[PDB]
Each structure stands twice: as C-alpha cells, then as structure tokens.
Amino acid sequence: YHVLFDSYRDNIAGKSFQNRLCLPMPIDVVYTWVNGTDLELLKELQQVREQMEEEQKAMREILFEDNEELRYSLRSIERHAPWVRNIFIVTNGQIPSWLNLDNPRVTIVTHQDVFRNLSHLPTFSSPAIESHIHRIEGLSQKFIYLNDDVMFGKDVWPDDFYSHSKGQKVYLTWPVTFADSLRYVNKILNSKFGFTSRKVPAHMPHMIDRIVMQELQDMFPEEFDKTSFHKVRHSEDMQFAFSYFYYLMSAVQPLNISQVFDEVDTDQSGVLSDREIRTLATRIHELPLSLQDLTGLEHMLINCSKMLESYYDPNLPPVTKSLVTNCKPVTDKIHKAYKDKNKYRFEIMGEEEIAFKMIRTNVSHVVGQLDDIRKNPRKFVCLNDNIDHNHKDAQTVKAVLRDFYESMFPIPSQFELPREYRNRFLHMHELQEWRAY
Amino acid sequence: YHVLFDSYRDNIAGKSFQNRLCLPMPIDVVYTWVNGTDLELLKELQQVREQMEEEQKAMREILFEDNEELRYSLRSIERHAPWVRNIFIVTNGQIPSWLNLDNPRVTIVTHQDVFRNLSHLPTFSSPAIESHIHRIEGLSQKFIYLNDDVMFGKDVWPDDFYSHSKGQKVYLTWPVTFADSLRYVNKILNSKFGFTSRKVPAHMPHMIDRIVMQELQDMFPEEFDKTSFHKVRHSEDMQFAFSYFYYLMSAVQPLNISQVFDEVDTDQSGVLSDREIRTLATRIHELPLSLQDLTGLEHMLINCSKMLESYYDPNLPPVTKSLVTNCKPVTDKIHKAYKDKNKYRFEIMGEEEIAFKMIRTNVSHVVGQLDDIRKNPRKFVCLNDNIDHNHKDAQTVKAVLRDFYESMFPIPSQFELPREYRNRFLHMHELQEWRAY
Ligand SMILES: *[C@@H]1O[C@H](CO)[C@@H](O[C@@H]2O[C@H](CO)[C@@H](O)[C@H](O)[C@H]2NC(C)=O)[C@H](O)[C@H]1NC(C)=O
Numbered sequence: 001y002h003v004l005f006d007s008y009r010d011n012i013a014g015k016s017f018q019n020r021l022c023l024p025m026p027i028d029v030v031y032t033w034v035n036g037t038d039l040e041l042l043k044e045l046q047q048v049r050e051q052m053e054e055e056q057k058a059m060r061e062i063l064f065e066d067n068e069e070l071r072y073s074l075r076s077i078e079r080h081a082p083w084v085r086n087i088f089i090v091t092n093g094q095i096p097s098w099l100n101l102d103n104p105r106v107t108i109v110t111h112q113d114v115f116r117n118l119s120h121l122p123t124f125s126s127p128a129i130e131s132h133i134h135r136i137e138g139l140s141q142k143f144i145y146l147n148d149d150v151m152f153g154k155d156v157w158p159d160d161f162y163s164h165s166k167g168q169k170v171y172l173t174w175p176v177t178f179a180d181s182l183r184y185v186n187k188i189l190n191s192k193f194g195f196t197s198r199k200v201p202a203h204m205p206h207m208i209d210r211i212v213m214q215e216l217q218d219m220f221p222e223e224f225d226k227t228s229f230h231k232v233r234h235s236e237d238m239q240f241a242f243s244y245f246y247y248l249m250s251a252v253q254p255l256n257i258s259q260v261f262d263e264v265d266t267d268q269s270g271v272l273s274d275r276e277i278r279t280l281a282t283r284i285h286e287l288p289l290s291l292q293d294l295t296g297l298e299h300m301l302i303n304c305s306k307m308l309e310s311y312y313d314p315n316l317p318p319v320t321k322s323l324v325t326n327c328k329p330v331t332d333k334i335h336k337a338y339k340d341k342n343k344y345r346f347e348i349m350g351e352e353e354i355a356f357k358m359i360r361t362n363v364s365h366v367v368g369q370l371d372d373i374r375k376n377p378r379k380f381v382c383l384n385d386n387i388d389h390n391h392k393d394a395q396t397v398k399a400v401l402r403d404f405y406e407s408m409f410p411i412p413s414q415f416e417l418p419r420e421y422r423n424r425f426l427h428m429h430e431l432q433e434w435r436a437y
Numbered sequence: 438y439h440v441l442f443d444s445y446r447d448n449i450a451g452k453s454f455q456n457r458l459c460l461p462m463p464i465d466v467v468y469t470w471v472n473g474t475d476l477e478l479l480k481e482l483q484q485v486r487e488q489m490e491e492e493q494k495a496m497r498e499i500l501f502e503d504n505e506e507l508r509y510s511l512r513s514i515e516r517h518a519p520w521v522r523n524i525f526i527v528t529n530g531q532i533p534s535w536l537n538l539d540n541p542r543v544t545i546v547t548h549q550d551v552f553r554n555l556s557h558l559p560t561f562s563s564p565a566i567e568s569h570i571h572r573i574e575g576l577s578q579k580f581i582y583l584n585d586d587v588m589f590g591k592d593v594w595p596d597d598f599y600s601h602s603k604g605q606k607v608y609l610t611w612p613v614t615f616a617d618s619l620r621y622v623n624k625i626l627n628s629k630f631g632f633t634s635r636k637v638p639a640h641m642p643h644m645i646d647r648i649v650m651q652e653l654q655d656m657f658p659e660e661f662d663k664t665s666f667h668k669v670r671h672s673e674d675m676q677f678a679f680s681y682f683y684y685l686m687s688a689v690q691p692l693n694i695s696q697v698f699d700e701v702d703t704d705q706s707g708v709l710s711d712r713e714i715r716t717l718a719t720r721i722h723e724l725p726l727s728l729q730d731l732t733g734l735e736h737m738l739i740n741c742s743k744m745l746e747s748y749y750d751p752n753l754p755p756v757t758k759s760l761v762t763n764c765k766p767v768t769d770k771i772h773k774a775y776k777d778k779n780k781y782r783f784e785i786m787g788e789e790e791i792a793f794k795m796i797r798t799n800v801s802h803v804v805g806q807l808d809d810i811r812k813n814p815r816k817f818v819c820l821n822d823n824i825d826h827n828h829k830d831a832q833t834v835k836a837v838l839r840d841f842y843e844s845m846f847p848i849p850s851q852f853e854l855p856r857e858y859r860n861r862f863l864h865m866h867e868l869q870e871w872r873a874y
C-alpha cells in the first residue's frame with residue numbers, strides 16, 4: 001500500500017534507504033543433478049576408453065544409486081528457506097522423474113545454455129559445470145549454489161550468507177584430484193595476490209555474486225578455459241568455493257585520490273580550510289603531528305601551484321582538488337598512508353553451523369552420526385553417501401539414511417509430482433538394526 | 438509501486454518476509470539537554486540547602502558553559518544517521534535558543550509528560566530523567582538514547598545497534614556517585630539472576646526497546662521509584678546502560694513443552710512416529726543413545742497412558758501432545774536436557790568503534806586526542822568536557838574543541854534556526870596554540 005512505500009521516506013533526510021535496509025533480494029538457488037542412467041554410463045565408458053587411447057598414443061610417442069537426495073534437499077529449501085525466488089537445476093539433458101515441471105519456480109537448465117563453447121558440453125566433470133552457472137539467463141545477481149547433497153536446517157535466512165555491513169560471509173575449514181586442484185589454485189592465487197596461508201571453504205550452500213564471479217573469470221580467462229576443456233575432473237582446474245571466496249578476500253582496489261579529497265572536504269565546497277588541511281595532515285603523517293609536518297604539507301602545496309576563509313600562511317593558494325591531485329609528493333604520501341584496501345568486504349566464521357558427516361558402511365556409526373545431527377540441529381547439513389554398495393550392511397545404511405531424511409523433511413514439496421502412492425519403502429530394515437542393537 | 442509490494446511475495450512460499458528482512462523501523466532518537474541558567478542554578482542551590490538542612494536534622498536526631506554540543510550532535514544525526522524518523526529532547530521547561538521548533542521532526546518533551554508521579558519532576562538528576570524515556574508518547578518501539586555529548590561518525594546504520602539474527606548489540610567495557618550506582622545495580626542483579634562477573638557498558642548512543650525497558654521497570658517497581666524519588670544523583674539508583682543491557686543478557690524464559698513437542702513433530706499431525714520419538718530420545722538423553730534409553734522412554738510413555746503408522750512396541754499408545762505434556766518423568770527429563778534459555782538475544786563486541794576521550798585543560802594533550810580522532814574516524818565519538826574553567830588554558834581548549842566540532846560537522850542542520858550571521862567565534866586562539874607550538 002502507499003503508506004508502506006511512503007514510510008521509508010519518513011526519516012529526517014526525506015529519502016528512501018531500501019537498498020541499505022532490506023537485504024539483497026531476489027535470491028535464487030542453483031542445483032547440479034546427475035543421474036546414473038545407462039546412456040550416461042556408456043558415454044563415460046567411451047570417454048575413459050578415449051583417455052586410455054590417448055595415454056597409449058603418448059607412450060607410443062615416448063617409444064549409480066542415489067538416496068533421492070534432491071527430493072529432500074528441495075523439501076529443505078521449501079521448509080527452511082522459503083524466501084527463494086526461483087530454483088535452477090543444471091543437467092545434461094536429464095529431468096528428474098519426480099520433478100513437477102509445471103511449477104514456474106523450478107527450471108531445468110541444460111548444458112547447451114550454460115556452456116559458452118558448445119564443443120565442450122559432453123563434459124562429465126563437476127568443475128566444468130560449476131564454471132558457468134553465473135551465465136544462466138534470468139539468474140539473480142546473488143544466488144546460492146547447492147550441491148544436491150547439502151540441505152538446510154534451523155530456518156536459515158539471507159542474513160546467514162551476506163550482510164550489508166560486513167559483506168559476504170565466508171565459512172572456512174582445515175588449512176590447505178580435488179586436493180590437487182586446491183594446491184593448484186593456491187599456487188595460482190599466490191602468483192597473483194602474493195603468498196598467504198590459506199584455509200579451504202566448507203561444503204555448504206554457497207552464495208555467489210555474478211558480477212564478482214564474472215570478474216574472476218575475466219581475471220583468469222585462460223585458466224577457466226582449462227577447467228571447461230577437461231571432460232574429467234583434472235588435477236588442474238578452478239574450484240567454486242576456493243576460487244571465488246579467495247578472490248573475494250584478496251581483490252585489491254586502487255586508491256581514489258578524489259575519494260580522499262571528498263572524505264576530507266566536509267564543506268563539499270571544493271576548497272579546503274585550515275581544519276581540513278589539518279585532518280589531511282593527521283591522516284597522512286604519523287601521530288603525534290608536529291607542526292613541521294603541517295608546514296611541510298603547506299610547502300609542498302605552495303610549490304605545486306607555482307610549478308603548475310583565510311589560511312594562516314599568506315602564501316598558501318586556495319586548496320582545491322586539482323592542487324592535491326596534481327602535487328606528486330602529496331599524492332605519494334597519500335598512497336603511502338592509505339595503502340591498498342580490499343575491493344570486496346567479507347566476514348570469517350568457523351565450522352559451527354555446518355554438518356559434514358561421513359557415511360561409511362558401519363550401521364552403528366551411521367546411526368550415531370544421524371543421532372548427533374538429530375540432537376543438535378545445524379543450519380547446513382551435508383551427508384556424503386560413500387557407501388561400499390557391495391557389503392552386508394549397504395541396504396541397512398541406505399534405509400537408515402532415508403529414515404533420517406523422512407524424519408527431517410516428511411511433507412512432499414511443491415516441486416514434486418503427485419506421487420509416492422503406496423510407495424512403502426522398506427520400513428523393516430531400520431527395525432532389523434533396532435533388533436540387532 | 439505495486440511491483441515493489443508484490444516483489445516480497447515472489448518467493449517459493451508466496452508469503453512476505455518484510456518483518457525479517459528490512460530491519461526494525463522506525464527508529465527515534467532521544468536527547469537529554471540541560472542549560473546552566475540562573476533560575477535552574479537557584480533551584481539547585483535551594484535543593485542543596487534543603488539537603489544540608491536534612492543532614493543537620495538527622496544529626497540533631499543523633500544528638501555552566503557548554504560548547505554547543507547539542508548543535509553538533511544534531512548535525513551528526515542528520516549527516517551520519519539520516520534514517521531517524523523523529524528526534525525527542527527532554528528538558529525541564531527549557532528550549533534551546535538555536536532549535537528550529539517549526540520542524541515537525543524535532544520535539545521538546547518536558548518533564549510533565551515524562552514523569553509519572555508529578556510530585557517528583559523538579560528532579561535535577563540524570564538517572565531520574567533516564568528512568569522514564571520509554572513513557573514518551575509517540576516514541577517508536579526501538580529508540581536510540583543520545584547523551585548530548587556523544588556524536589556519530591563513519592555513517593552509522595541500524596545494523597550497528599540491532600540485528601534480526603543475533604539480537605541487540607551490546608558494547609561492554611572495563612569490568613565493574615556513579616561507580617556506587619554500578620556496584621549497587623551489580624548487587625541487585627546478582628540477587629535476582631545469580632552472581633556473574635560483569636563488565637560495564639560504554640558511553641555511546643544506546644538502542645533501547647520500550648517493551649524490554651517496561652519489563653525491567655515492572656520487575657523492579659520499588660527500586661526504580663527510588664531512582665525517580667532522588668532529586669540528586671544518589672549512590673543507590675538504577676542506570677540506563679548497565680541495568681537495561683544486563684537484564685537483556687540475563688532474562689530467563691521458562692521452557693515451553695508445547696514448543697519442544699512442535700519442534701519434534703515434523704509432520705505437524707499431532708501424533709509422533711518412531712522417528713520423532715527417536716529424535717526426542719536423542720535430544721533428551723546423552724549420546725550415544727543406547728536402546729535402553731529409548732525403551733525406557735516408551736516405558737514411561739506407556740505407564741502414563743495407563744495411569745491417565747505402527748510403532749515397534751505393540752503396547753505403545755499413540756503419542757500425542759497430551760501424553761508427553763502430562764507424563765511427569767518425560768517432562769522432568771525434558772527440563773533437565775532443555776535447561777533455561779535466554780529470553781532476549783544479544784551480541785557482545787569490544788571498544789573498537791567507540792571514542793571516549795578525556796579533555797583536561799592541557800592544550801597539547803587535547804590537540805593530540807583530537808588529532809587521534811581525526812586520523813582514525815570512529816562510529817561513536819564522545820568528548821567529556823571537564824575543563825577546569827579557571828585556568829590560563831581554558832579558552833584555548835574550548836576553541837580547539839569548537840574547531841574540531843566545526844571541522845567534523847560544518848554544515849548547519851535542519852533543526853537549527855537560521856542564525857550564526859557574522860557569529861565569528863574566536864578564530865585566533867587555535868592560531869595562538871599553533872604559534873606557541
Ligand atoms: C535415472 O535413470 C534411471 C535409469 O538408471 C531411470 O529410471 C528408469 O525410468 C524408466 C521410465 O522412463 C523405466 O522404464 C526404467 O525401468 C527405469 N530404470 C531403472 C533402473 O529404474 C530414470 O531416468 C532416472 N530415475 C531416477 C529415480 O532418477
């Protein structure tokens with residue numbers, strides 16, 4: 001209503017500060033989903049055969065099952081993060097069988113649109129898909145990247161990914177074919193932004209800015225092409241969390257002398273007075289300010305005018321922006337005092353709202369981990385499903401995981417086709433674990 | 438426009454989350470201003486005479502100048518915090534000579550309206566005025582209390598006082614007639630909320646919630662009346678920062694068993710399943726969860742039904758809210774596990790954006806402190822004006838302080854009457870300090 005619109009101009013200034021008070025909206029969610037079908041497995045087999053043939057030629061020169069983790073992740077999106085505008089899922093050409101495509105808020109984005117160089121799209125490698133989400137048409141400027149196995153909890157909010165005051169929120173972990181990529185990107189970033197002891201980010205829903213990601217891609221045009229070229233995840237490729245966040249944390253912005261002059265000129269009258277010249281002297285020199293420093297500043301100023309509301313020294317000309325921006329000694333001292341800032345703001349937190357649990361084929365340990373998740377709910381829950389799949393305790397662990405998923409998120413979502421009539425997944429395996437224990 | 442209103446319902450849920458995304462608005466600012474006029478000084482003299490007479494009767498039973506710091510503080514309000522809706526100034530009956538009362542966004546609130554017990558209002562004591570700001574009519578639910586000597590800087594935002602996620606922001610200082618009040622309130626709070634090693638808050642613009650302050654007043658009805666009764670700041674009275682913040686940080690909310698049942702019942706169907714009973718067992722007991730604990734939980738549940746979608750134990754009745762909320766052992770274990778939470782959220786930071794500088798009659802030291810303020814601007818700047826006023830270096834320090842004020846905030850505000858024509862305050866005292874140095 002009009003009163004709500006006119007209530008943001010009810011302040012003393014009379015302006016509207018929606019852009020500084022109402023968070024970045026809209027925010028979208030991007031998923032990467034792959035299915036273990038026969039055709040895709042055959043294509044992978046052909047690609048591996050080609051890889052082996054290439055290795056043989058080089059040496060001659062010398063001479064399956066998913067625990068429907070997308071369904072529950074989408075349910076978590078709808079339940080805990082209901083402020084998401086649209087949901088994008090990137091797939092080869094595959095559409096989930098349970099996905100309700102009639103919903104306008106869910107879209108399947110194939111690899112034709114995502115990839116730029118259409119001689120690359122049979123790509124079968126997660127970093128290559130990860131390279132080009134920011135090129136999705138219709139995607140909001142800030143979007144959250146979900147990895148199809150990470151879920152939500154405790155009713156997350158956009159305040160958990162970005163803040164207008166402290167910028168994006170970076171969640172880091174243990175210090176630094178996937179560890180090789182981390183080492184390679186560490187070397188590449190040390191080459192550009194200098195050597196720094198770096199940690200690696202956590203596996204969790206990552207908020208990504210399209211402008212920042214595009215700037216990162218433009219900064220390394222050749223290297224991101226290697227990531228896209230490789231049709232199997234290589235030792236040398238650029239990641240998603242590590243590359244984006246550390247470019248965000250090490251983006252250097254050159255000093256704007258006009259900004260210094262404007263922040264000092266409180267009158268906004270173009271000319272500086274003795275008080276503003278004195279605050280220049282304070283910000284430039286090191287405290288305490290001896291009058292020698294201020295007299296030297298005025299001396300460098302009177303020199304420059306000769307080469308190119310009354311002040312105490314009668315010989316000092318009116319100090320406009322042109323004098324300070326053209327006087328080399330003053331600009332040199334300004335650069336030496338105002339050294340390089342950071343182009344992007346960021347905030348660093350620990351692993352306190354992140355649940356990365358490792359599921360290895362031990363029903364007692366799996367139940368223990370899931371009970372730990374149940375007792376203390378956490379905002380970001382990730383469950384890596386590396387079950388042996390050839391073991392006496394594979395179906396039992398799958399049943400335990402599905403029971404945890406159905407306990408956390410039981411209600412079917414709006415993105416799911418009307419289904420699961422008489423589905424009745426095995427309800428007796430978890431009872432077998434109960435009876436054995 | 439309507440698209441802006443309909444853009445908050447563009448999410449997947451279809452609802453509007455303005456109350457969780459756009460910060461608490463509106464926010465007001467409250468000032469306490471006193472003038473050293475002849476009539477007020479005479480009234481103070483009469484009150485002191487009465488105090489001496491009372492002391493004499495008890496033993497018989499045994500037998501001036503302000504550096505216009507409100508002007509510059511209001512200028513700082515307009516420049517650095519332009520999101521304030523209205524500004525309230527509480528005075529005895531005094532109106533500042535420079536205040537533009539024709540502005541609808543500035544109001545003088547006398548002591549008639551502020552005080553509840555009109556036989557108390559000739560009160561001449563800062564805590565007594567401080568007691569009853571939350572009773573100002575038209576005041577917003579969250580307001581900022583300015584002490585007429587604290588200013589702003591670095592373009593403060595409502596994010597610097599309150600966050601929707603971590604609650605109000607508490608700025609604390611060195612651990613604990615004003616120190617006596619701190620000790621007394623520490624004793625009173627230790628009596629109610631138990632002994633705790635407490636720090637004292639900083640002198641800075643304090644954001645105050647009227648509901649929380651009213652709850653604090655109701656919690657100690659007798660003690661806040663002593664604060665209001667005393668017509669001179671006494672050793673025993675309740676402060677503003679210390680009393681409010683520590684009640685905020687030690688407000689205990691009793692456990693809501695219905696909340697536990699609702700957070701566990703993911704189906705929201707009223708009845709719990711084996712998975713939800715198991716997450717109850719995880720949250721109640723201590724990990725790891727032996728099946729003995731879960732069987733005991735079901736045993737306490739089957740007991741209670743006798744005294745008052747199939748589960749593994751055939752004897753367990755449907756577990757609705759009534760069973761768990763009426764079973765004494767289960768509620769006892771829930772209370773023991775879910776011990777007392779805190780009624781209000783809060784966040785703790787250090788003295789990093791607070792400038793409390795002490796001005797004592799040494800021109801070199803005053804200039805050093807003001808240069809330190811100039812070199813590193815800080816969000817909250819407080820300058821205590823305890824000049825000797827009988828010294829060879831009083832006018833010089835006043836001129837230095839006024840020059841700092843006019844350098845920081847030179848532009849006349851909207852709350853100031855059109856004035857200061859040919860005012861020309863002494864521009865030669867600071868030059869005398871320059872020449873002496
Ligand atoms: C993932 O791929 C599987 C095949 O691996 C597909 O499931 C098939 O669906 C068709 C219907 O179009 C059936 O005729 C086949 O019998 C199914 N095969 C199997 C092995 O179940 C489907 O495209 C995808 N399934 C899921 C659950 O994502």
Ligand SMILES: *[C@@H]1O[C@H](CO)[C@@H](O[C@@H]2O[C@H](CO)[C@@H](O)[C@H](O)[C@H]2NC(C)=O)[C@H](O)[C@H]1NC(C)=O
Nearest residue numbers: 360361362363364365366367368369393724725
């Ligand atoms: C599966 O996990 C359980 C723990 O959940 C393992 O039990 C451990 O057994 C060793 C000795 O066998 C003990 O020293 C540990 O204290 C046990 N753990 C706990 C938490 O008590 C069990 O060994 C694991 N089984 C396999 C095959 O790895």
Ligand SMILES: *[C@@H]1O[C@H](CO)[C@@H](O[C@@H]2O[C@H](CO)[C@@H](O)[C@H](O)[C@H]2NC(C)=O)[C@H](O)[C@H]1NC(C)=O
Nearest residue numbers: 471472473474475501503505531532533534535
């Ligand atoms: C504070 O009180 C002073 C008096 O201490 C007042 O200034 C007086 O203003 C009247 C005009 O109504 C003049 O006739 C007097 O000569 C002034 N006295 C002095 C000592 O200046 C005024 O009410 C207040 N002044 C300020 C600056 O707040």
Ligand SMILES: *[C@@H]1O[C@H](CO)[C@@H](O[C@@H]2O[C@H](CO)[C@@H](O)[C@H](O)[C@H]2NC(C)=O)[C@H](O)[C@H]1NC(C)=O
Nearest residue numbers: 287288797798799800801802803804805806830
């Ligand atoms: C006023 O402050 C200055 C510092 O701003 C004082 O100068 C100090 O003098 C003592 C000895 O007299 C030295 O040990 C200190 O190192 C000086 N301070 C600095 C920062 O160099 C001066 O003494 C003060 N004057 C009075 C009267 O208190």
Ligand SMILES: *[C@@H]1O[C@H](CO)[C@@H](O)[C@H](O)[C@H]1NC(C)=O
Nearest residue numbers: 116117118119120228229230
């Ligand atoms: C990418 O496209 C360019 C021209 O658009 C082409 O020369 C190059 O070979 C492509 N990269 C491949 C096919 O890996």
Ligand SMILES: *[C@@H]1O[C@H](CO)[C@@H](O)[C@H](O)[C@H]1NC(C)=O
Nearest residue numbers: 255256257258259260262263
């Ligand atoms: C930064 O510098 C550019 C050109 O040098 C100028 O257009 C811009 O206004 C400056 N930013 C400010 C003054 O905030």
Ligand SMILES: *[C@@H]1O[C@H](CO)[C@@H](O)[C@H](O)[C@H]1NC(C)=O
Nearest residue numbers: 295296297299300302303304
């Ligand atoms: C420039 O200023 C310095 C003082 O910092 C002075 O010594 C020098 O003589 C000036 N330059 C000229 C050409 O006079």
Ligand SMILES: *[C@@H]1O[C@H](CO)[C@@H](O)[C@H](O)[C@H]1NC(C)=O
Nearest residue numbers: 553554555556557665666667
């Ligand atoms: C406060 O008001 C009550 C009645 O409203 C009165 O009895 C009491 O004396 C008052 N307190 C004073 C005058 O200090």
Ligand SMILES: *[C@@H]1O[C@H](CO)[C@@H](O)[C@H](O)[C@H]1NC(C)=O
Nearest residue numbers: 692693694695696697699700
């Ligand atoms: C807290 O308890 C009260 C009554 O005991 C109830 O009305 C309210 O809904 C509960 N809060 C919840 C369920 O969030």
Ligand SMILES: *[C@@H]1O[C@H](CO)[C@@H](O)[C@H](O)[C@H]1NC(C)=O
Nearest residue numbers: 732733734736737739740741
């Ligand atoms: C209540 O349950 C306990 C098991 O925790 C059991 O020992 C006891 O017999 C039950 N009460 C009755 C009256 O049977």
Ligand SMILES: [Ca+2]
Nearest residue numbers: 267269271272
């Ligand atoms: Ca100026």
Ligand SMILES: [Ca+2]
Nearest residue numbers: 704706708709
């Ligand atoms: Ca249920």
